Write a protein that binds this ligand. Structure first.
Ligand SMILES: Nc1nc2c(ncn2[C@@H]2O[C@H](COP(=O)(O)OP(=O)(O)OP(=O)(O)O)[C@@H](O)[C@H]2O)c(=O)[nH]1
Ligand SMILES: Nc1nc2c(ncn2[C@@H]2O[C@H](COP(=O)(O)OP(=O)(O)O)[C@@H](O)[C@H]2O)c(=O)[nH]1
Ligand SMILES: [Ca+2]
Ligand SMILES: [Mg+2]
Ligand SMILES: [Mg+2]
Lengths: 440, 61, 421
């Protein structure tokens, strides 16, 4: 019961999916042929991990996931990679032509050619679920598939699954790795279109993640492999609540209740700790006080923005590993003495805590040290709107001269879709301002 | 009344989604082909021109 | 998986076409007998974009050789790699260029265009997924320019949603084997502004000036010029031919480079003609430009830049950031993040480290101004119009091309003067 279906869309989505699913198998003791010596529930079961892995009579544990790209290159690596026995071939879906960093191609031209098969395959996953809870959609903001096809899929998923929950892990462009000058365009259009279809989107800033890799791991020039492995550790923490259980566990939906005060205000900010290399973690065992402190250093956020210059509407701490309430309570308390984490006046100022006692693990050959405990803080803060403002400004500079717009009109889009998307974001930005003003 | 409203609003949300999607794919296929229609018709005034120049070249003797 | 169809046409087209194939087939480990021979599988990961899998796993250039004149065929086969070209793709009909754009486009060119369109189809039909097309050709001649642009129009008609990419060589009065080429050039560009998605602007003036002024060659061979065009063309296709973290194709490049459809004329560059700071600085220097334009006389809309060799990618990111920061007024503020750069750790041979530059600069208008200065320089007095009205043409079609090309220079100027506020 309570199964979740992951959907990884486009290059970034798929390569994050490699990172996440590789980590999931290591955390659950699943081997690359799907076999899990631990599970004596052959061919089925209702253990906590079964939210994310179906089972076959052969004992193979199969991701409840779907990779879809409009181009075969990157999924072909899944197809021939180490973990290639995990999946039924039909979970790995590719076209031939990609969306060429174009939202229109990904949402209309190319994507409409494959949307029905993707749904037809998502349906096949849904029908092995006894209590399907919702979807996890991993995609980038910036690519033509990550933007255009995801928002297409999301519309289609609302129609076919009602208000069944859809959470996003969205990859927010960084100019250090930005592959297209039109990424702001794609970013605005996809955000406008999935906004009323997403219940909760965790934005992952490539520049934040990139900065953290350079700084906390002395990685001279991080690669997508560097980023995705760190990203996956954050995703592991957010989904741990779903994949493991214990007394102190707190289901991610319980956090979602606190995290979303209004439907459009559904973009939490994540902060993770410790991010630390083996060389530096050797002989430095990190207390729950140190990792909790590190939550409130902005260097460890997944989006670059200043919570110090916005207001909180929620603060959650998601602990995994050797971590006890008493120690958490102590750490939080000194944080409250030593920090003014101000909330909006319509909002209680509690910090909501969860503890998954299963300790994090690492993918071998990583640079992240294997730590005993970890924390991911999920807060709703008006400061995350800075990430809309940065993108909205880049859209504006180009759209005022209509730069590159012709590539979109050429595929059937109208300028009006641009203006209407840009205005939604204008309105989202003032939503974020309004919720921060004091009541009267 | 409450549970049949939760049902009604879930359904109207599916409804409008279903329609907003269909209406935009129709406006898109139209607009895209109009641009390919416009593109090919441009190329054919070039074909028609490539002959009024060739036929003009016979109109000498 | 994602295939490009190549087309040489006319004298210059077929010779620079040949060196291209010699250069890139060497880099992919393909001997003149089409057998793989290389040391790494990276050579073959994306060999399919330019080559066909053949009998006994031979690799055959997806190339189409075109000319209205004999000589150019026996020279391609007698030349190295001439046997690797399949023999049916030599399409070819003899009544001569006459360096006449009229004959190339309308009259003598239109005869075997249906015969070239024939062979293009046979090559597109085998494409698992045809990216689009690549044309090497002159703008000064008559076959390469006049029939060359006629193909484009015809090819675009059959493949309207394919990317049409050309390497056009612009006429200079040095190097000039004729005198009517200003006519031919602006008649071609009046075509290019309308029916190509990406045109690499290869200026004989710029090329000649490099071998003379820079490389010190008081008498430069066409083989000297084409040694420039070969290393250039290998540069700007390194993104297409090898695996890179942009899976680069003609469309993704066009999207990143062309902010408005008519401004698709790129100012290429190469270094060296060695450290990443030196390589970077040289690659942006006016002297290393393959168009005879000064980039400090206008502003970059977009720029692509590919580094080849063993380097530190941190240095390249530090250096590429340096040049934009230190030269901020030369990049339009209203296209953020408009300088994209890739790194291939496999150098071209002879070089340990090279850099190729592709720029959409409004200083490219200098190149059209030079041509418009000499296209007119027969047209006040109405000179040699018989060469053209004789093949049937009208006067306005000469004036329209004129205005169209002036409409484009001012359009480049308009966006050079645009500000973010
Ligand atoms: N963190 C991370 N970001 C990625 C990865 N791959 C691509 N990106 C980011 O994604 C954005 C581009 O989107 P892509 O996923 O490459 O686009 P796509 O989904 O493949 O769309 P098209 O190829 O145009 O059809 C850029 O901002 C990249 O920096 C990845 O593996 N990890
Ligand atoms: N760079 C370069 N330019 C050439 C070459 N061959 C011819 N040209 C130029 O091409 C123009 C004449 O075009 P050409 O291809 O010879 O005419 P065609 O017979 O009608 O195709 C002149 O500007 C020449 O300088 C060559 O191998 N390299
Ligand atoms: Ca130490
Ligand atoms: Mg892709
Ligand atoms: Mg000739």
């Amino acid at each position: 019961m309570r199964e979740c279906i992951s959907i990884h869309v486009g290059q970034a989505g798929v390569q994050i999916g490699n990172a996440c699913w590789e980590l999931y198998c290591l955390e659950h003791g699943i081997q690359p042929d799907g076999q899990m010596p631990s599970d004596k529930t052959i061919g089925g079961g209702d253990d906590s991990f079964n939210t994310f892995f179906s089972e076959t009579g052969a004992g193979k544990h199969v991701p409840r996931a779907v990779f879809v790209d409009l181009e075969p290159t990157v999924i072909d690596e899944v197809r021939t990679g180490t973990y290639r026995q995990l999946f039924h071939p039909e979970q790995l879906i590719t076209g031939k032509e990609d969306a060429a960093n174009n939202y229109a191609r990904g949402h209309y031209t190319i994507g409409k050619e494959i949307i029905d098969l993707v749904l037809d395959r998502i349906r096949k996953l849904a029908d092995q679920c006894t209590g399907l809870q919702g979807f996890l959609v991993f995609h980038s903001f910036g690519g033509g598939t990550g933007s255009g096809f995801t928002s297409l899929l999301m519309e289609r998923l609302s129609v076919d699954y009602g208000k069944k929950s859809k959470l996003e892990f969205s990859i927010y462009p960084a100019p250090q790795v930005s592959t297209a000058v039109v990424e702001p365009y794609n970013s605005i259009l996809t955000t406008h279109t999935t906004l009323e279809h997403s219940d909760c989107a965790f934005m992952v800033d490539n520049e934040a993640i990139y900065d953290i890799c350079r700084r906390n791991l002395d990685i001279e020039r991080p690669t997508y492999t560097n980023l995705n492995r760190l990203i996956s550790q954050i995703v592991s923490s957010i989904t741990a609540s779903l994949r493991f259980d214990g007394a102190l566990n707190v289901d991610l939906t319980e956090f979602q209740t606190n995290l979303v005060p209004y439907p459009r205000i559904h973009f939490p900010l994540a902060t993770y700790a410790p991010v630390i290399s083996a060389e530096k973690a050797y002989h430095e065992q990190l207390s729950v006080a140190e990792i909790t402190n590190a939550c409130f250093e902005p260097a460890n956020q997944m989006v670059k923005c200043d919570p110090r210059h916005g207001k909180y509407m929620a603060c959650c701490l998601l602990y995994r590993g050797d971590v006890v309430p008493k120690d958490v309570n102590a750490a939080i308390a000194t944080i409250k003495t030593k920090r003014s984490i101000q909330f909006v006046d319509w909002c209680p100022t509690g910090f909501k805590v969860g503890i998954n006692y299963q300790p994090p693990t690492v993918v071998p050959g990583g640079d992240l040290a294997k730590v005993q405990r970890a924390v991911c803080m999920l807060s709703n803060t008006t400061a995350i709107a800075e990430a809309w403002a940065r993108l909205d400004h880049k859209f504006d500079l180009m759209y005022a001269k209509r730069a590159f717009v012709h590539w979109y009109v050429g595929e059937g889009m109208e300028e009006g879709e641009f203006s209407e998307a840009r205005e939604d974001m204008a309105a989202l930005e003032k939503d974020y301002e309004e919720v921060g003003v004091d009541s009267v | 009344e409450v549970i049949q409203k939760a049902i009604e609003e879930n359904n109207n949300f599916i409804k409008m989604a279903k329609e907003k999607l269909a209406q935009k794919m129709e406006s898109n296929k139209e607009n895209r082909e109009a641009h390919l229609a416009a593109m090919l018709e441009r190329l054919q005034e070039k074909d028609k021109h490539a002959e009024e120049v060739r036929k003009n070249k016979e109109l000498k003797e | 998986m994602r295939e490009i169809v190549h087309i040489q046409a006319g004298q210059c087209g077929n010779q620079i076409g040949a060196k291209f194939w010699e250069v890139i087939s060497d880099e992919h480990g393909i001997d003149p007998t089409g057998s793989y021979h290389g040391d790494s599988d990276l050579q073959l990961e994306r060999i399919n974009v330019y080559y066909n899998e053949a009998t006994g796993n031979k690799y055959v250039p997806r190339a189409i050789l075109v000319d209205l004149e004999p000589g150019t065929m026996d020279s391609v086969r007698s030349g190295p790699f001439g046997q690797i070209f399949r023999p049916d793709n030599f399409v070819f009909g003899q009544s001569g260029a006459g360096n006449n754009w009229a004959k190339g486009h309308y009259t003598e060119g239109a005869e075997l265009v249906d015969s070239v369109l024939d062979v293009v189809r046979k090559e597109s039909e085998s494409c698992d997924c045809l990216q689009g097309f690549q044309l090497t050709h002159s703008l000064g001649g008559g076959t390469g320019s006049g029939m060359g642009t006629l193909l484009i129009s015809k090819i675009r008609e059959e493949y309207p949603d394919r990317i049409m990419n050309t390497f056009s060589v612009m006429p200079s009065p040095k190097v000039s084997d004729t005198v009517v080429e200003p006519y031919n050039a602006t008649l071609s560009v009046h075509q290019l502004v309308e029916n190509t998605d990406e045109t690499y602007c290869i200026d004989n003036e710029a090329l000649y000036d490099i071998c003379f002024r820079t490389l010190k060659l008081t008498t430069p061979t066409y083989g000297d010029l084409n040694h420039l065009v070969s290393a250039t063309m290998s540069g700007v296709t390194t993104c297409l031919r090898f695996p890179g973290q942009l899976n680069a194709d003609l469309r993704k490049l066009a999207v990143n480079m062309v902010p408005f459809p008519r401004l698709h004329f790129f100012m290429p560059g190469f270094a060296p003609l060695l450290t990443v700071p030196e390589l970077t600085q040289q690659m942006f220097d006016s002297k290393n430009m393959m168009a005879a334009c000064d980039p400090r006389h206008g502003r970059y809309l977009t720029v692509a830049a590919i580094f080849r060799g063993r380097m530190s990618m941190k240095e390249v990111d530090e250096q590429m950031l340096n040049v934009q920061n230190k030269n901020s007024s030369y990049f339009v503020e209203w296209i953020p993040n408009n300088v994209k750069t890739a790194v291939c750790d496999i150098p071209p041979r002879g070089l340990k480290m090279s850099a190729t530059f592709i720029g959409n600069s409004t200083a490219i208008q200098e190149l059209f101004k030079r041509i418009s200065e000499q296209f007119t320089a027969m047209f006040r007095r109405k000179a040699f119009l018989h060469w053209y009205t004789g093949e049937g043409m009208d006067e306005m079609e000469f004036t329209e091309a004129e205005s169209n090309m002036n409409d484009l220079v001012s359009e480049y100027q308009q966006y050079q003067d645009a500000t973010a506020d």
